Scaffold this active site. Structure first.
Site, PDB file in Angstrom:
ATOM      1  N   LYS A 198     -10.266   5.997   8.693  1.00  0.00           N
ATOM      2  CA  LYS A 198      -9.312   6.847   7.965  1.00  0.00           C
ATOM      3  C   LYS A 198      -9.685   8.290   8.154  1.00  0.00           C
ATOM      4  O   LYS A 198      -9.720   9.058   7.183  1.00  0.00           O
ATOM      5  CB  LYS A 198      -9.387   6.522   6.452  1.00  0.00           C
ATOM      6  CG  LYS A 198      -9.122   5.115   6.064  1.00  0.00           C
ATOM      7  CD  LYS A 198      -7.695   4.800   6.317  1.00  0.00           C
ATOM      8  CE  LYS A 198      -7.228   3.647   5.440  1.00  0.00           C
ATOM      9  NZ  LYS A 198      -8.154   2.472   5.532  1.00  0.00           N
ATOM     10  N   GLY A 221      -2.439  -5.315   3.701  1.00  0.00           N
ATOM     11  CA  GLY A 221      -1.831  -5.563   2.405  1.00  0.00           C
ATOM     12  C   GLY A 221      -1.300  -6.982   2.273  1.00  0.00           C
ATOM     13  O   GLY A 221      -0.575  -7.279   1.324  1.00  0.00           O
ATOM     14  N   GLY A 235       1.283  -8.805  -0.087  1.00  0.00           N
ATOM     15  CA  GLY A 235       2.112  -8.924   1.099  1.00  0.00           C
ATOM     16  C   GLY A 235       2.206 -10.327   1.664  1.00  0.00           C
ATOM     17  O   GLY A 235       1.271 -11.123   1.539  1.00  0.00           O
TER      18      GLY A 235
HETATM   19  O1  LIG Z   1      -2.806   1.142   3.561  1.00  0.00           O
HETATM   20  C1  LIG Z   1      -3.801   0.528   3.853  1.00  0.00           C
HETATM   21  C2  LIG Z   1      -4.681   0.811   4.927  1.00  0.00           C
HETATM   22  N1  LIG Z   1      -5.747   0.068   5.136  1.00  0.00           N
HETATM   23  N2  LIG Z   1      -6.054  -1.012   4.336  1.00  0.00           N
HETATM   24  C3  LIG Z   1      -7.272  -1.756   4.638  1.00  0.00           C
HETATM   25  O2  LIG Z   1      -7.004  -3.012   5.184  1.00  0.00           O
HETATM   26  C4  LIG Z   1      -7.844  -4.005   4.589  1.00  0.00           C
HETATM   27  C5  LIG Z   1      -6.983  -4.939   3.771  1.00  0.00           C
HETATM   28  O3  LIG Z   1      -7.868  -5.861   3.123  1.00  0.00           O
HETATM   29  P1  LIG Z   1      -7.363  -6.990   2.090  1.00  0.00           P
HETATM   30  O4  LIG Z   1      -6.583  -8.096   2.951  1.00  0.00           O
HETATM   31  O5  LIG Z   1      -8.628  -7.579   1.564  1.00  0.00           O
HETATM   32  O6  LIG Z   1      -6.524  -6.388   0.977  1.00  0.00           O
HETATM   33  C6  LIG Z   1      -8.959  -3.260   3.899  1.00  0.00           C
HETATM   34  O7  LIG Z   1     -10.071  -2.978   4.769  1.00  0.00           O
HETATM   35  C7  LIG Z   1      -8.285  -1.978   3.508  1.00  0.00           C
HETATM   36  O8  LIG Z   1      -9.191  -0.869   3.319  1.00  0.00           O
HETATM   37  C8  LIG Z   1      -5.246  -1.379   3.276  1.00  0.00           C
HETATM   38  O9  LIG Z   1      -5.510  -2.295   2.617  1.00  0.00           O
HETATM   39  N3  LIG Z   1      -4.154  -0.583   3.082  1.00  0.00           N
HETATM   40 CL   LIG Z   2      -7.460   1.523   2.799  1.00  0.00          CL
END
Ligand SMILES: O=c1cnn([C@@H]2O[C@H](COP(=O)(O)O)[C@@H](O)[C@H]2O)c(=O)[nH]1
Ligand SMILES: [Cl-]
Ligand SMILES: O=c1cnn([C@@H]2O[C@H](COP(=O)(O)O)[C@@H](O)[C@H]2O)c(=O)[nH]1
Ligand SMILES: [Cl-]
EC number: 4.1.1.23
Lengths: 212, 212
Positions: free
Chosen positions: B62, B171, B177
């Site tokens: 990021k 998500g 999601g």
């Molecule tokens: O808008 C965004 C961008 N990136 N991630 C990243 O993608 C992963 C999603 O993980 P999860 O399936 O455990 O929620 C994590 O590393 C998180 O920081 C999100 O969740 N949302």
């Molecule tokens: Cl994130």
């Protein structure tokens, strides 16, 4: 990696190279690209293949120059997107170290070619091969290339580099090497003409995989 | 790429991270590594994963700094072996261009994050998201990240970037999601907790794949 089979894409026309590589992609995820294709279609073909096929690319450039020139060649090659580069060990340790330094700077890998697969390799390379492999071990090299056409030499090379080093091997098929016998010592086999000149490249690849 | 499923490996212990990633490797060949793992185990974990699993690595850093600092971060990240880096677009075009310049120099890729998936994204990011995506198109960006939690926004993003751009989406699962709905617009889904906190990560991955 996939199926322990690496495609040597030495066709010299972009359209034919893309056609064959696409046809065999379900069987191979690693493509070796050399000068026949790059000098005919340009270095941009590396990034194109990587993107279109999602495959790893080994640049078979047989780097064999003085240190300073080797550094420039490796930098241009990794900038082009190659994941690894094949380097000759015969020019000596300083020349290999130059390649390793650039690979370290760019997060890439060097494969050290110790003994070649063709008849002429017996003249000068074979006699220096064990020492070239030991040099690789001393320099920290972890990826090597050895001959499918001489499994007793491939066994000796594996003995020097150890079981944890990664060894790939060309000379399978057209040059006379056998897939299964080669895989007794190498982690993966490189195959070019037996696949890319076949009437049905996908069927040729599938057949090799089935045989092993 | 494989199965259009990318594993978000956010465990913070090397042993657990290696265990889960190995267990699901037959289903996924692309792993997203972020700061939870890197800040706990070091940047060398990227090359270790790449070697041990033969997977592509997306560094979810990021990046969101001024141009000069972004350049340094991207260089260190690609030196570590990452294939791609995720960059925020909110800090502006000069900051994104700095990342693109390093990716070009090193033969790597930049993924532009346009809209985030969490509730707070509605406060400031969502209102700038379309413009951030258009900025990406204008800068030549070809890889994007959009939210699984808002498929109508993912559709709008896909509309701006076109069908040839590559779009990945986090998500899925824990944040709410849905795999299938997200894949109507994105090329691949990112899944973390639904897989890595499952009693049987391999079974969780297999289930997601079967559902799509
Ligand atoms: O808008 C965004 C961008 N990136 N991630 C990243 O993608 C992963 C999603 O993980 P999860 O399936 O455990 O929620 C994590 O590393 C998180 O920081 C999100 O969740 N949302
Ligand atoms: Cl994130
Ligand atoms: O000792 C070596 C090193 N490299 N190669 C290369 O591996 C490929 C083997 O192709 P083939 O299956 O068509 O013989 C070609 O690109 C060739 O330059 C060899 O054949 N032998
Ligand atoms: Cl050769």
């Amino acid at each position: 990696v996939m199926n322990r089979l690496i495609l040597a894409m030495d066709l010299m026309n972009r359209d034919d190279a893309l056609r064959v590589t696409g046809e065999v992609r379900e069987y191979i995820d690693t493509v070796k690209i050399g000068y026949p294709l790059v000098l005919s279609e340009g270095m941009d073909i590396i990034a194109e293949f990587r993107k279109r096929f999602g495959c790893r690319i080994i640049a078979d450039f047989k780097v064999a120059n003085i240190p300073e020139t080797n550094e420039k060649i490796c930098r241009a090659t990794f900038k082009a997107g190659a994941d690894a580069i094949i380097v000759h060990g015969f020019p000596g340790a300083d020349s290999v170290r130059a390649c390793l330094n650039v690979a370290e700077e760019m997060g890439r890998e060097v494969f050290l070619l110790t003994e070649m697969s063709h008849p002429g390799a017996e003249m000068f390379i074979q006699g220096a091969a064990d020492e070239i492999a030991r040099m690789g071990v001393d320099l920290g090299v972890k990826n090597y290339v050895g001959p499918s056409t001489r499994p007793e030499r491939l066994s000796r090379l594996r003995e020097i580099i150890g079981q944890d080093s990664f060894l790939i091997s060309p000379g399978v098929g057209a040059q006379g090497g056998d897939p299964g016998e080669t895989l007794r010592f190498a982690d993966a086999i490189i195959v070019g003409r037996s696949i890319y000149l076949a009437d049905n490249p996908a069927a040729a690849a599938a057949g090799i995989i089935e045989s092993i």
